Amino acid sequence: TGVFTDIPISNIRRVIAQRLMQSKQTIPHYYLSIDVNMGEVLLVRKELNKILEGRSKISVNDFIIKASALACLKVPEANSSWMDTVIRQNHVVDVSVAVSTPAGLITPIVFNAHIKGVETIANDVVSLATKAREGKLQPHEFQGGTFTISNLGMFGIKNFSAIINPPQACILAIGASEDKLVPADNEKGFDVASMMSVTLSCDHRVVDGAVGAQWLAEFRKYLEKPITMLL
């Protein structure tokens, strides 16, 4: 090997790097972080998995996608886009999920995620992830979207701040779920809760701080009262 070895850069890596560099140069990022109690989703998911006797498997990421779509419906600015001359506001929610394929990163798109149930979302995500790991995806199946979600809780990451795609305006970053020790009014005086920390990276020329904070509040409410998704 020697002292160092230089690895030539592929064209795909080159164009991805150019796009990421342009995004970081043009989009002024600002980060907003909150914490979510996942003890109710942890029970709803278990009950739904029991009900679906092998018919389907529902993950926490599916509830996360559903809550993100509903919050984008309530606060349209986080689902908007910047086009220099005009600001485009999308009335449909396309959620691009980041999957860490062992060749880089892939972004399968779940379309119309605001009017789909968690089971359809789960099936679509599983099929798209299998196709992405296979290596066969149409350009329209991974290029585009209105919102982006990236999860790194499987790796033990507690918090992280992702990068916005050039056309979009926000991106959600999900970290690991951990059992914290929150205060309680019971005999002991404390209670164990499963907490998850999420960071939203907003474009400040499109999303204001109060707007992003409202979006995070609605997302947290949807995730902490899962029955609210019926409304």
Nearer to a second copy, 49 or 141 (CB): 49
Nearer to a second copy, 99 or 137 (CB): 99
Q: Are 43 and 110 in contact (CB under 8 A)?
A: no
> Exposed (0-12), middle (13-18) or buried (19+): which is 146, by Cβ within 10 Å?
buried
Residue 198: which of 156, 150, 146, 147 has the closest Cα? 150
42 is a contact residue toward a second copy (CB under 8 A): no
Compute the least distance from the CB of residue 126 to a second copy, in Å.
15
208 is catalytic: yes
124 is catalytic: no
Active-site residue identified among 124, 191, 203, 204? 204
- Give me the amino acid identity at 88: R
> Exposed (0-12), middle (13-18) or buried (19+): which is 188, by Cβ within 10 Å?
exposed
Q: Are 18 and 10 in contact (CB under 8 A)?
A: no
Residues 43-82 that bind a second copy (CB under 8 A): 44, 47-48, 51-52, 56, 58, 66
Residues 140-199 that bind a second copy (CB under 8 A): 150, 152, 155-163, 179-183, 188-190, 192
Compute the least distance from the CB of residue 24 to a second copy, in Å.
4
From the annotation, which residues make up the binding site for CoA?
45, 59, 150-151, 175
List residues with catalytic annotation. Answer: 204, 208
